[PDB]
PDB file of all heavy atoms in Angstrom:
ATOM      1  N   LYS A  51      84.847 -46.666 -37.971  1.00 24.21           N
ATOM      2  CA  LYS A  51      85.716 -47.514 -38.775  1.00 24.21           C
ATOM      3  C   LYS A  51      87.064 -46.808 -38.948  1.00 24.21           C
ATOM      4  O   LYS A  51      87.123 -45.580 -38.968  1.00 24.21           O
ATOM      5  CB  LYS A  51      85.056 -47.928 -40.096  1.00 24.21           C
ATOM      6  CG  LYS A  51      83.699 -48.629 -39.951  1.00 24.21           C
ATOM      7  CD  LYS A  51      82.725 -48.530 -41.123  1.00 24.21           C
ATOM      8  N   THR A  62     105.888 -33.833 -36.214  1.00 24.31           N
ATOM      9  CA  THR A  62     105.536 -34.150 -34.831  1.00 24.31           C
ATOM     10  C   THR A  62     106.005 -35.557 -34.461  1.00 24.31           C
ATOM     11  O   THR A  62     106.178 -35.857 -33.279  1.00 24.31           O
ATOM     12  CB  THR A  62     104.038 -34.013 -34.552  1.00 24.31           C
ATOM     13  OG1 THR A  62     103.386 -34.841 -35.517  1.00 24.31           O
ATOM     14  CG2 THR A  62     103.547 -32.578 -34.608  1.00 24.31           C
ATOM     15  N   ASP A  83      74.881 -32.902 -33.788  1.00 23.04           N
ATOM     16  CA  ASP A  83      74.989 -33.678 -35.016  1.00 23.04           C
ATOM     17  C   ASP A  83      75.988 -33.017 -35.971  1.00 23.04           C
ATOM     18  O   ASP A  83      76.153 -33.487 -37.091  1.00 23.04           O
ATOM     19  CB  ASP A  83      73.630 -33.979 -35.631  1.00 23.04           C
ATOM     20  N   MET A  95     106.146 -43.959 -32.437  1.00 33.25           N
ATOM     21  CA  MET A  95     107.033 -44.988 -31.910  1.00 33.25           C
ATOM     22  C   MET A  95     106.303 -45.877 -30.898  1.00 33.25           C
ATOM     23  O   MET A  95     105.508 -45.417 -30.093  1.00 33.25           O
ATOM     24  CB  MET A  95     108.246 -44.355 -31.223  1.00 33.25           C
ATOM     25  CG  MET A  95     108.779 -43.159 -31.995  1.00 33.25           C
ATOM     26  SD  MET A  95     110.575 -43.199 -31.991  1.00 33.25           S
ATOM     27  CE  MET A  95     110.955 -42.781 -30.285  1.00 33.25           C
ATOM     28  N   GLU A 110      85.372 -53.264 -39.655  1.00 37.04           N
ATOM     29  CA  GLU A 110      84.775 -53.395 -38.334  1.00 37.04           C
ATOM     30  C   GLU A 110      84.781 -52.067 -37.580  1.00 37.04           C
ATOM     31  O   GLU A 110      85.729 -51.284 -37.637  1.00 37.04           O
ATOM     32  CB  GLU A 110      85.664 -54.363 -37.558  1.00 37.04           C
ATOM     33  CG  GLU A 110      84.894 -55.267 -36.599  1.00 37.04           C
ATOM     34  CD  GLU A 110      85.764 -56.266 -35.856  1.00 37.04           C
ATOM     35  OE1 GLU A 110      87.022 -56.326 -36.015  1.00 37.04           O
ATOM     36  OE2 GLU A 110      85.105 -57.000 -35.087  1.00 37.04           O
ATOM     37  N   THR A 127      98.496 -46.600 -26.546  1.00 42.01           N
ATOM     38  CA  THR A 127      98.316 -48.044 -26.474  1.00 42.01           C
ATOM     39  C   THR A 127      97.568 -48.410 -25.197  1.00 42.01           C
ATOM     40  O   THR A 127      97.021 -49.507 -25.115  1.00 42.01           O
ATOM     41  CB  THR A 127      99.670 -48.750 -26.569  1.00 42.01           C
ATOM     42  OG1 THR A 127      99.339 -50.064 -27.006  1.00 42.01           O
ATOM     43  CG2 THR A 127     100.439 -48.720 -25.267  1.00 42.01           C
ATOM     44  N   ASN A 135      82.131 -55.206 -31.461  1.00 48.36           N
ATOM     45  CA  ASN A 135      81.544 -56.532 -31.405  1.00 48.36           C
ATOM     46  C   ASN A 135      82.311 -57.415 -30.418  1.00 48.36           C
ATOM     47  O   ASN A 135      81.913 -58.567 -30.185  1.00 48.36           O
ATOM     48  CB  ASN A 135      81.409 -57.161 -32.790  1.00 48.36           C
ATOM     49  CG  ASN A 135      80.370 -56.467 -33.647  1.00 48.36           C
ATOM     50  OD1 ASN A 135      79.479 -55.790 -33.124  1.00 48.36           O
ATOM     51  ND2 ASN A 135      80.468 -56.603 -34.964  1.00 48.36           N
ATOM     52  N   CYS A 153      81.727 -41.780 -12.338  1.00 33.93           N
ATOM     53  CA  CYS A 153      82.781 -40.797 -12.554  1.00 33.93           C
ATOM     54  C   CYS A 153      82.859 -39.785 -11.413  1.00 33.93           C
ATOM     55  O   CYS A 153      83.955 -39.346 -11.053  1.00 33.93           O
ATOM     56  CB  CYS A 153      82.599 -40.036 -13.861  1.00 33.93           C
ATOM     57  SG  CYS A 153      82.687 -41.092 -15.334  1.00 33.93           S
ATOM     58  N   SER A 163     100.093 -56.162  -7.821  1.00 24.14           N
ATOM     59  CA  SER A 163     101.006 -57.111  -7.182  1.00 24.14           C
ATOM     60  C   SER A 163     100.500 -57.504  -5.801  1.00 24.14           C
ATOM     61  O   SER A 163      99.704 -56.770  -5.205  1.00 24.14           O
ATOM     62  CB  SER A 163     102.373 -56.543  -7.037  1.00 24.14           C
ATOM     63  OG  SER A 163     102.262 -55.384  -6.211  1.00 24.14           O
ATOM     64  N   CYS A 174      86.973 -49.075  -5.621  1.00 27.77           N
ATOM     65  CA  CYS A 174      86.877 -50.504  -5.871  1.00 27.77           C
ATOM     66  C   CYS A 174      88.247 -51.040  -6.251  1.00 27.77           C
ATOM     67  O   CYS A 174      88.932 -50.458  -7.075  1.00 27.77           O
ATOM     68  CB  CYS A 174      85.899 -50.847  -6.976  1.00 27.77           C
ATOM     69  SG  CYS A 174      84.281 -50.091  -6.733  1.00 27.77           S
TER      70      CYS A 174
END
Side-chain angles (χ1 to χ4, degrees), residues 62 95 110 127 135 153 163 174:
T62 55
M95 319 221 289
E110 215 178 1
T127 202
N135 291 339
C153 297
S163 61
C174 308

